[PDB]
Symmetry: D2
Subunit: 211 residues, 4 copies
């Protein structure tokens, strides 16, 4: 139903020397997958798609600490679309905090708080990347608890991985191979935030940016 | 330095001079600060921030009321400055979420909601980011909370500081703009979920104050 | 009829340390007058105003070598407005080269070439700054020669100076004091091109950036 | 390096994936290069340009057919790199205007119009900027003209190089993207004054080729 921009397993992304990359990350990356500008353009069409469905009303729900970058960009584009409406349209930003921990055995989620502003509203879940689908599934049954009118998921990234298949996202920026990516929205123990593009972390970068 | 001082004298900018959404044509008095002006100042603030806190870790803490547009923007420029460093410097981004109470007759009373492991701040260099400071009571009482977790040093940055007799004297370390004692909306400041799509800082008109009130 | 954003003689512009300025220009400027971002915003409203009048058709006329920056920015905003039209709208960019020389006595203008694409069209003259008004007056009688349907002038800058008063511009970005400005569109013997803001050149900068 | 190689294999991007003006909904086949992608590559090109020509003067010469969007953009990124230099490095920006003839069956025949004091180029470091190279005949004969004024060194930069058997083998020094042998519009390439407002490089469809023809 729109798998988004499909980046296939075969020969993925771009050679490092084709784009501008912070020099201090020269050894910490393997290839580049999605240049920043390309993320921007897709995010724009995405915002157009969100208004089609949404817009009764809209509550955009950010996932805190981590997800702020993509949320901000997605919302900037929506604001950009909203400037031309003949009646000014109310829009509410919301926030859940959510942290995950490496598991022996079973998944660990630590949630969020104060979600009164959801009752009978159109709620958009914004995520950064979908791998196992647990974050999405958690955010789901959580908002379902507060009796909203509508619920969609938007996620910049869907990884091509084994999952329980539970709730397939409604809006997908990019469908990428099973590789570990950083930059743009995704840090690695606080590094790569200054990296605008989504790139594959290398082995040098993994060992260098400890934890 | 008190930032870009916008005078009581001749206020800001006539409305037809800049691009504004048709649906607010009636809901504003003046433009104080066009979007591009906010960006240019913010770029400078970010430079100023790296001068005093650069190299060291820094934890960027966003005072999160209704939105964080300013924070997002300050942090993009800061990330842009860090693109050059020989060593990549880890940047910790966090949020402290505040819910609004008694309207605004006593803003010094904070009710923090998004207050995860506040003890991360300890022994760390904290930059606290705010969008507007008015009476100064929110911040001064937020400072009291943050300092009890003993950071290595705290600096505050505010896009806008309002020049009011109702001020309790608290001055941020970094000021974007010092503005007249009038109620503003736009860029980062919403009004009952409105003006989110307004790029500029403009004074809210009375027909707009009434059309959009809770 | 819209004097544009009036920057008065009294206490003009901003202190240098309030904005980001290339370090190698630290001594070469006095104050800053119009930050880049501010130029952008005004240029946007300007593009909106141009479409009101123009749009039958439109030929935007750039003044070559010098004027490319502002033209490009003004046109980018117009393109941005044109995306939403229900019928795609043809737009023609044109070019005259024009150079001036310090005068003994009388003005020197060296013109341009190939302006067949003007007959019965709506022509916009784009300039960078208006001081004496000779450039504007020259561009005027020049296009008048090719029997256009319409003629307007847009200029980012109008200086508050003695002039022959001949043809007052239709669109004006900013009305600035009688000071010598550089940056954004205005170089000084090839310097300040990397400067985004319009600032007053200092005496140190004048003597340093020779000729 | 032949730039970002876009394959003959799977072309570019489906139209509904990106934002495109409604009035061209029918006039395109595929998107090859979204605007943001063009910006990111161009940023890199500019870096590459300063590596080999940095510090020295450089005269940036724009091959000006219908527009100069690419040139303007390359030069903004170059100016952005020069913001850091200890000495400010003077940059000379010039244009060489070419009018189109015999349609395009013999593009090697240039007719230069905007050719002011060509003898400025002499003893100077020239970067020649072009938006697309197809058969390569325009450039190779432009090179012959420019070299007769004996510069100190000439480099060429092209946003797009088309991979065609009709190519005479000329390769620019700097390539943005190497693309399939299909007729493209958008970003910098207009079609009879159309697609100026199209941000992306997209293949022109046949219903668009006909609706917009001279
Ligand atoms: N930076 C970075 N993080 C990754 C990546 N893959 C997983 N993660 C961990 C966070 O994403 C979890 C989503 P889920 O709840 O498993 O659906 C990655 O490719 N880059
Ligand atoms: N949008 C908008 N909000 C305003 C304004 N003034 C106060 N507020 C409320 C938030 O600022 C209070 C912080 P404080 O504790 O008083 O320093 C305003 O002029 N615009
Ligand atoms: N950089 C720079 N140049 C200036 C300035 N003032 C004049 N000039 C010279 C070019 O402008 C001539 C316009 P005219 O034909 O006299 O109406 C200036 O304040 N900065
Ligand atoms: N818009 C557009 N124009 C094209 C295209 N192909 C050729 N042209 C004409 C200009 O390029 C010719 C230069 P050359 O001398 O052949 O190297 C195209 O695919 N799109």
């Amino acid at each position: 139903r729109s798998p988004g921009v499909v980046i296939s397993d075969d020969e993925p992304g771009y050679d490092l020397d084709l784009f501008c990359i912070p020099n201090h990350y020269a050894e910490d990356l393997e290839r580049v997958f999605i240049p920043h500008g390309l993320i921007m353009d897709r995010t724009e069409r995405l915002a157009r798609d969100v208004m089609k469905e949404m817009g009764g009303h809209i509550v955009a729900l950010c996932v805190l600490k981590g997800g702020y970058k993509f949320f901000a960009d997605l919302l900037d584009y929506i604001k950009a679309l909203n400037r031309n409406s003949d009646r000014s349209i109310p829009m509410t930003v919301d926030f859940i905090r959510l942290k995950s921990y490496c598991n022996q055995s079973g998944d660990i989620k630590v949630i969020g708080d104060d979600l009164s502003t959801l009752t009978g509203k159109n709620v958009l879940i914004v995520e950064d990347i979908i791998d196992t689908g647990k974050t999405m599934q958690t955010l789901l049954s959580l908002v379902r608890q507060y009796n909203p009118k509508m619920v969609k998921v938007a996620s910049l990234l869907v990884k091509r991985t084994p999952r329980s298949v539970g709730y397939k996202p409604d809006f997908v920026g990019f469908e990428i191979p099973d590789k570990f990516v950083v930059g743009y929205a995704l840090d690695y123990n606080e590094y790569f935030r200054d990296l605008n593009h989504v790139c594959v972390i290398s082995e040098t970068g993994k060992a260098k940016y400890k934890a």
